[PDB]
Amino acid sequence: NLQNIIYNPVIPFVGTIPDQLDPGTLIVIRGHVPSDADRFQVDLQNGSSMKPRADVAFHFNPRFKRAGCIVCNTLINEKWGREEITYDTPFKREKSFEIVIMVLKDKFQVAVNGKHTLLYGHRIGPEKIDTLGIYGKVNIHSIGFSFSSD
Amino acid sequence: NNLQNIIYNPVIPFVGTIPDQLDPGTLIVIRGHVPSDADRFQVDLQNGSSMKPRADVAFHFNPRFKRAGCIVCNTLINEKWGREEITYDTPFKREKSFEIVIMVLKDKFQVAVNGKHTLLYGHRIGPEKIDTLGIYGKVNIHSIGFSFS
Ligand SMILES: Cn1c(CO[C@@H]2C=CO[C@H](CO)[C@@H]2O)nc2ccc(C(=O)O)cc21
Ligand SMILES: Cn1c(CO[C@@H]2C=CO[C@H](CO)[C@@H]2O)nc2ccc(C(=O)O)cc21
Ligand SMILES: [Cl-]
C-alpha cells in the first residue's frame, strides 16, 4: 500500500503530505547516518513557515554524542515542550536505517529496522500535520506514506 | 491446550472483559460455526462496552457472506468508521465450522482461520486500549480462550 512522495531528496527536505495522517497511516523513511553525524531530525509540521517557525507536532531527533539517544518533543508557538528521551537507540554513525512511523489515534509508534523504538503521545492533533521536514546530518533514500484513506 | 480464561457456548451477542492486556504475542482463539442464513457476524476488540456513545472498536473483524463473500476490517473512533480494508479471499462459509486465531503483534493483528493465514490489519488504536471482546451477528461460538504474553 506504500506511495513514495520522493527518492534521494536533498537535505534539508520539506514536503507537503498529500493526505491526512489518519489513524493507521504509516510514514516510511529509508536512509543512512554519515560517519560524522551529530544529529538529524524528522519533523511532522503544521506548514512550512520559517518566519515564524512552523509548529512541530512530532520532532524525532536521533543524537549521536556519547552512547547516543533519541529526543522527541513538540514545538508550539516557537517554544519546545517536555523532552521525551529514549536512551535505547538503534541508530549509529555510518549505518543504514528504515524508520516506520505508525500514526495511531492517541500516539505515534516508531519502529526502526523492524524493532519497536518508542511511543510519543499526540500534543497537537495529528489532523493539523500537513508537512514533513528532514534536517541535519543524514542521507535519505526514500520517504513514503501508506495512507489509511487509500 | 494451555489456553487461559476458556469459556464455552457464550450467549450471542457476547460482550466480555478481556482478562489481561493484548501485549505482543497474545492470542485470542474463537471456535464456532456460521449458520446457513448468515448475512454477517463480527468480532470487535473494543475500548470498553459503552453503547451510547458507542465504544471505540480498535479491530472490527466482519466476515460477510453475500455474493463471493469477504471479510471487512475497520476501526470505529468517536462513532465514525474509517477506511474499510476488505479481504476478498475469505475462508468463512455458511454451515462451516471455524477456529479464529488473532495474534496481536506490536504493529498489526495477524489472523489465521483453521490454521491458514487469512489477513493482516495494521493498528489504528494502540492495542493497550482494548479491554472488551464483542461478538455480534449471525454466528454460534463454541469456545473463547486466550494466550497472554
Ligand atoms: C538544531 N535544530 C533545531 C532545534 O532543535 C532543538 C534543539 C534542542 O532541543 C529540542 C528538542 O527538545 C530541539 O532538538 N531545529 C533545526 C532545524 C534544522 C536544523 C538543520 O541542521 O538544518 C537544525 C535544527
Ligand atoms: C451492522 N452492525 C454494526 C455496524 O457495522 C458497520 C456497517 C457497515 O460497515 C462498517 C465497516 O466499515 C461496519 O460493519 N455494528 C453492529 C453491532 C451489532 C450488530 C448485531 O447484529 O448485533 C450489528 C452491527
Ligand atoms: Cl492510540
CSV table of C-alpha atoms and ligand atoms in Angstrom, one decimal, chain B residues 12-13 39-42 44 46 51 54 57 60-62 64 72-76 81-86 135-138, ligand 2:
chain,number,residue,atom,x,y,z
B,12,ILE,CA,-24.7,-14.1,21.4
B,13,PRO,CA,-24.5,-11.1,21.5
B,39,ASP,CA,-25.5,-12.3,6.3
B,40,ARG,CA,-22.6,-11.2,8.5
B,41,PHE,CA,-21.1,-11.5,12.1
B,42,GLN,CA,-18.3,-9.5,13.7
B,44,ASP,CA,-14.9,-6.5,17.8
B,46,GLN,CA,-13.3,-2.7,21.9
B,51,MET,CA,-23.5,1.5,23.9
B,54,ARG,CA,-20.7,3.6,21.1
B,57,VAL,CA,-13.6,-0.5,18.1
B,60,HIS,CA,-13.7,-4.9,13.7
B,61,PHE,CA,-13.3,-8.3,12.0
B,62,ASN,CA,-16.5,-8.6,9.9
B,64,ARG,CA,-19.8,-11.0,5.2
B,72,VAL,CA,-14.4,-6.3,6.1
B,73,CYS,CA,-11.9,-4.9,8.7
B,74,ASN,CA,-12.3,-1.4,10.1
B,75,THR,CA,-11.9,0.7,13.2
B,76,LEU,CA,-14.6,2.8,14.9
B,81,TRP,CA,-15.9,4.2,10.8
B,82,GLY,CA,-12.6,4.5,9.0
B,83,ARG,CA,-11.5,3.3,5.5
B,84,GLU,CA,-12.6,-0.4,5.1
B,85,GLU,CA,-9.8,-3.0,4.5
B,86,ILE,CA,-11.6,-5.7,2.5
B,135,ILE,CA,-19.1,-11.0,19.2
B,136,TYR,CA,-22.3,-10.0,17.4
B,137,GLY,CA,-24.5,-11.1,14.5
B,138,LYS,CA,-25.4,-14.5,12.9
C,2,LIG,C1,-24.3,-3.9,11.5
C,2,LIG,N1,-23.6,-3.7,12.8
C,2,LIG,C2,-22.7,-2.8,13.0
C,2,LIG,C3,-22.1,-1.8,12.0
C,2,LIG,O1,-21.3,-2.4,11.1
C,2,LIG,C4,-20.7,-1.4,10.2
C,2,LIG,C5,-21.6,-1.3,9.0
C,2,LIG,C6,-21.0,-1.1,7.8
C,2,LIG,O2,-19.6,-1.0,7.6
C,2,LIG,C7,-18.8,-1.0,8.8
C,2,LIG,C8,-17.3,-1.4,8.5
C,2,LIG,O3,-16.8,-0.3,7.7
C,2,LIG,C9,-19.4,-1.9,9.9
C,2,LIG,O4,-19.5,-3.3,9.6
C,2,LIG,N2,-22.3,-2.8,14.4
C,2,LIG,C10,-23.1,-3.8,14.9
C,2,LIG,C11,-23.2,-4.4,16.2
C,2,LIG,C12,-24.1,-5.4,16.4
C,2,LIG,C13,-24.9,-5.9,15.4
C,2,LIG,C14,-25.8,-7.1,15.8
C,2,LIG,O5,-26.2,-7.8,14.7
C,2,LIG,O6,-26.0,-7.5,16.9
C,2,LIG,C15,-24.8,-5.4,14.1
C,2,LIG,C16,-23.9,-4.4,13.8
